[PDB]
From a paper:
The [name] proteins are ubiquitously expressed in all eukaryotic cells and are involved in the regulation of diverse cellular functions, such as metabolism, signal transduction, cell cycle control, apoptosis, transcription, and protein trafficking. The [name] proteins, including all isoforms, belong to a single family with structural similarity and are thought to function as homo- or heterodimers. In potato, the nonepsilon [name] protein St14 interacts with the potato homolog of FT protein, StSP6A, and bZIP transcription factor [name] and regulates potato tuber formation. Eleven [name] isoforms were reported in potato, designated as St14a-k.
Author numbering:
A (entry chain A), B (entry chain A): 1 to 233
Write the structure that this text describes.
């Protein structure tokens, strides 16, 4: 049967801003496939869905962490005990969300990507979500997450380097996250700045062969890489 | 024991924008009382909580209804069947949210309000939430909701008229919702415009006895009543 229906429901879920439902709908598109790949449209929806569901918990996690620290500085110890419990609950959510998208990548989407844009897309996403585990996980789970990120970003760059134009927003967007993760989580500015400037230089080397729709895609990203290189200096 | 804790958790829930949790926390404050009333702070949190939880479903309901109608006009009948199912689900949520706050008003907060500001506050809220049932319920449930609203708004105005200054933001805010409900749901512009201009005129009759904190409260509302009277003409 046709489940353009679940795709149509996911676009309604998006319009309604009911993102948890958007995820369940795109998870139903993905776990119903035999040999078929998600279209671009479909993989983009799955990604908008997870990005909005994880975004909201990341933002809760950041305000709850600021409060946790302001109250720790003031010696308000009953508050801290309460904030910690709340942070713990949000961490539980964050960790199950990451596990849901990782499980779908590891066992449906990555093993069935054929084109290279697809392989880079799913391997980047896998990295993106291990990076999110790494922002809050602790101990050995933080270490396994930082390594899973690096190794997914690397396997993605290997394929992006050969099989995708230097100007492709997947390859540029992979460069942006990879460069930021080297700097912010591995504390390696040399590397961060390097593959940033590499991704930028390479992509102006062929910027003189895009459309008026192809441009707005990768120009947005190219400018993000640029303001970081000047920032990072 | 002290459950300033649940109040503190509700303020964390608000900061995190986890409003469903804010509701559960303020519901726990309210269902734990013996003879005690919610403070102003507490009744305001309960209200911020329910307002954000119902706001998000009302907004989903409005975009899903616009889509439902655009697709009905274009003859896209598979879409409509899908949109209707989605609208139905959002209606289920809206109806259980309204029932939760109504159950807490009808059986904890209204029967124990002592001061009059408190009685007007809970009776207004009861009206506010029956008004929301009336926006989407259908048939006899819509009729029982429109009447429950009217009768809660009336019982509230009876008390606001004697026991609260004409300038009190509860009494003015009650006037705003009451006036809007007469116009938009009962289709009675004469009445809408009347008790709007009455609430405004009466409140400038004593506007020359407020603070610099008391003012910003009821001026915001007084200007809302004013732009409607000119609009409604």
């Amino acid at each position: 049967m046709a489940r353009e229906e679940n795709v149509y429901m996911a676009k309604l879920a998006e319009q309604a801003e009911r993102y948890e439902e958007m995820v369940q709908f795109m998870e139903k598109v993905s776990t119903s496939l035999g040999s078929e790949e998600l279209t671009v449209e479909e993989r983009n929806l799955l990604s908008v869905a997870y990005k909005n569901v994880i975004g909201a918990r990341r933002a809760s996690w950041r305000i709850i962490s600021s409060i946790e620290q302001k109250e720790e500085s003031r010696g308000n110890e009953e508050h801290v005990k309460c904030i910690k419990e709340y942070r713990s609950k949000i961490e539980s959510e964050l960790s199950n969300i990451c596990d849901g998208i990782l499980k779908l990548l590891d066992s449906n989407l990555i093993p069935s990507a054929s084109n290279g844009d697809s392989k880079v897309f799913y391997l980047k996403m896998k990295g993106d979500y291990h990076r999110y585990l790494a922002e809050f996980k602790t101990g050995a789970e933080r270490k396994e997450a930082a390594e899973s990120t690096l190794s997914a970003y690397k396997a993605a760059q290997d394929i992006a380097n050969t099989e995708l134009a230097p100007t492709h927003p997947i390859r540029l967007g992979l460069a942006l996250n990879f460069s930021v993760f080297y700097y912010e989580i591995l504390n390696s500015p040399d590397r961060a700045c390097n593959l940033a400037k590499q991704a930028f230089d390479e992509a102006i080397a062929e910027l003189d062969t895009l459309g008026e729709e192809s441009y707005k895609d990768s120009t947005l990203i190219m400018q993000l890489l640029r303001d970081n290189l000047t920032l990072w200096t």
